[PDB]
């Protein structure tokens, strides 16, 4: 009553980050960033993108949706449910005062909104796009493409920027007791790597200390895990109404380049990802309702 | 529409720091990075201008006037595509030595526009309205995710490119002598100044939706969303009063409130062909 | 200094069209001269995609250097001088603000001149180290001189964005019609970055050009463009890093023997315009306050 | 064997850029747009606090920073400060160091690009604090002196100014970067904490391996004496202004301050003074460090 099972997952990780990223690799990057009007690539894609001819191909498959204006309402509603579920499950304190009281001016902590904004706004299309990778493989199913309404055809509402990518404090950059923010995250999430969110939040380290540690207590409470299902039941929802169809399965996995092997790692790698933006996205909802 | 009144906007680029502050909230709230004409004007009424958006913003904040503005974007693409057959002019402009990349900056521009002229027109409608009629619009509780923040990102930088009426030489002013006396207007609005940073451009743009302007379709499609305007209009999440008498205690006398209506209820009247106007331009870009 | 015979034709790529590989280069070019523009210069020997990037290989560790932004900013300097004394420039900031321009606009102007006006002689020094290489065989610098020559340049510039440039094919009916008077009166082909750039504010450019077209030609005009070259020609003799890029290299790089001779043509257009262009500029940014 | 000596101190209250109100805000952007850097110093944010000061020091100062002398002037303290630690440090490059850490070359480049930008302003800021300070202490009115017109002329005109450099904060710190920060203040000698190491400071592991290598030079005998030569090319630099500048103790009190304000400022000053000719070899160490 009632909680998502984190799907095992013993394959190693190997993003691959813009910074490092060569020029073939960054205009796919680019494309995506532009599609889904964000200035960060997911890990969950830099993950994806070590598997280069499978990323590209089921890109490719998947941006027709992602161009809709149905995949921008999609994406939005999983927003809405987010700050519905946590607001009605959480007596959540503000701590702008408590910001304001640690020297933080208003220029600041608005620059730190905007922060959690972009990640407010662009995580929910990372959902749909893991649960259409992680479900594709698994069912060798075709997904949407069906008959509807003609406006979920129309351009999305546009939008930016691709720029500039987010300050992030790497993990390499890191810290310190940067690192020990990073390693309590890691094990309370259950994670292998440090999100996009908390390296952006980084930037300000002693915010990031008293956000996480405000949410911490939250993570693996019944609420929570009771509402984590429901952000993914929606991402499943999702991709059975895509407005182009999508298929990519093992056997298209195979035909673009990939070994069993790597199949069966590719798999295990975004079974975890999608599993993780349940959570990342009732996280960031959190961290922007302290800082109402 | 009647007016007889001047129109006086106060451009960004002259905007004093006090003014510049609204500007920039208002920039922000609306997610948009140019001021429209429509707010210029009104800013000239500064103290109506500064209250009338004080009362307005907390609606502009919401996921209700996010979807309620989508929502006339959606529908005038709706009416564009059925109403008229638009030939794409993508192969048309690489003929005239437009590359791939220069033709994406038309689109990234006509995109601010799209996304933003019906906020604008929403806006325009409940200063109109409340004028006129001293109704007090909105304030329903009703569903709880309607006051829920908006879809948060958006971009407020840069300023986009606009060539100016005394920028403009010889034959631009030609095409905004020609714009403005189709649209029956006394300016220029932002989105052809900033499709005149390519001259060669505009000219074909215009060109192709200047014989749809007052066909019985283009009306019809104008009265249409401005219906949903009006709609929007009643239905805000906060509530909006700002009526003649309230212009009074802002600072305005009964006078500068009479030209304020007039000069309001001809931006109003523009907007809906403006967003009309800018689907047609977008569906030409492919 | 008279005009030399250029027959060939011109084929510069812009930065909206280069291809990737290209690409890369512009940026390294831009980077190391701290602009934020590709010169229309480099656009048309990069036509000659394999001479072009060996001459830049070649010609950068000099362009890195203390010596190389000291003798381009010395070029700036002297061409500013020039102008002040053979002619009497009129300040034009109160005309503009007469025609609507606000001083946040007029400021806007400046800053845009300024790019011109600190970058072109970087152009210069390069488009001579290219002409004379090809004409001459000869090997230019390397002397280990003064050590602080071969320091890093003052590291501060902006590269981005790329300037707004009003092109060719962006033009209006009038617009078309200045930019036929400047590629007539200046003798060139093309209409540089410049006038380009300054096109975003038609008005405004048709009154700049205005006033400085009668100044074009002169004899105070032609002897400050011989000065301006004289001292381009000596930033090439001593350039801190070797430079030598001849007929025979071009082949080694990769062209035909045809190619190069169109190439020196080519060239030797632009490195002539250079010089006129700089003081242009100057002529411009007088104009402004 | 020679040192320039630190005088002593009051309390020094910055008046930072993002809590700078709209009237400082407009001094803070033609300081930056006439020095042509993206930073306001926090030399000039102290000073900041006895505003209508600095709003006049700034106003007689800015006709000759708009100068190709000064230009000039402050790129040769750059180009001696290069000279100065390249023939007196065995400077070992620190880029596979980095590489090695996990940093990629976007990144180091990154890091090169924060680096140029303090390497460029600093020496511009130097002159300044050496103009306020000595003009405070003598009364006296420096250059204005007729020489080569060639000396008013404007400044090489291109700069990158608009987007502030990512600084973390004392207040954004957290845990061992406020130990590097007490370190440094420790070691330098100062209660604040310069703009450089916190721009330095978006990468923590970068900034504790650079200012680790730097550290055993600060005050060896070379590095004194090439402190002492920066400092000497400073008040040089003052007496050659091509625009007169004063700016008195009286100035400051018909400006608006009282005394024992004017006793403050002049300790502040004097500190911050001292301070820059120290970071611009600082800052030239960690440049050579990342070739």
């Not at 995506?32 to 280069?52: D, E, M, S």
């Not at 706004?121 to 493989?137: M, S, V």
């Amino acid at each position: 009553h009632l909680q998502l099972p984190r799907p095992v997952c013993e394959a190693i990780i190997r993003p691959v980050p813009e910074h490092r990223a060569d020029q073939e690799l960054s205009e796919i990057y680019r494309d995506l960033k532009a599609t889904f009007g964000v200035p960060w690539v997911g890990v969950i894609t830099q993950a994806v993108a070590y598997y280069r001819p499978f990323f590209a191909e089921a890109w490719r498959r998947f941006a027709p949706s992602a161009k809709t204006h149905f995949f921008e309402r999609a994406s939005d509603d999983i927003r809405i449910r987010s700050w519905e579920l946590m607001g009605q499950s959480f007596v959540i304190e503000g701590q702008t005062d408590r910001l304001r009281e640690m020297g933080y001016s208003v220029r600041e902590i608005g620059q730190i909104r905007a922060v959690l904004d972009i990640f407010d706004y662009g995580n929910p299309k990372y959902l749909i796009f893991a649960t259409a990778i992680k479900e594709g493989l698994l069912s060798g199913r075709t997904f949407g493409g069906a008959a509807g309404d003609a406006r979920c055809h129309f351009p999305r509402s546009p939008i930016c920027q691709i720029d500039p990518i987010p300050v992030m404090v790497e993990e390499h950059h890191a810290g310190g007791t940067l690192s020990q923010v990073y390693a309590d995250i890691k094990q309370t999430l259950q994670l292998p790597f440090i999100n996009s969110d908390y390296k952006a939040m980084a930037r300000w380290p002693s915010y990031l200390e008293q956000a996480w540690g405000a949410l911490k207590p939250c993570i693996d409470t019944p609420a929570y895990q009771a509402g984590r299902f429901d952000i993914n039941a929606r991402a499943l929802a999702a991709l059975d109404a895509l407005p182009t169809a999508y298929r990519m399965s093992r056997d298209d996995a195979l035909q673009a380049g990939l070994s069993e092997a790597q199949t069966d790692e590719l798999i295990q790698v975004i079974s975890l990802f999608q599993w993780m933006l349940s959570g990342l996205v009732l996280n960031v909802t959190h961290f922007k309702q302290q800082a109402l």
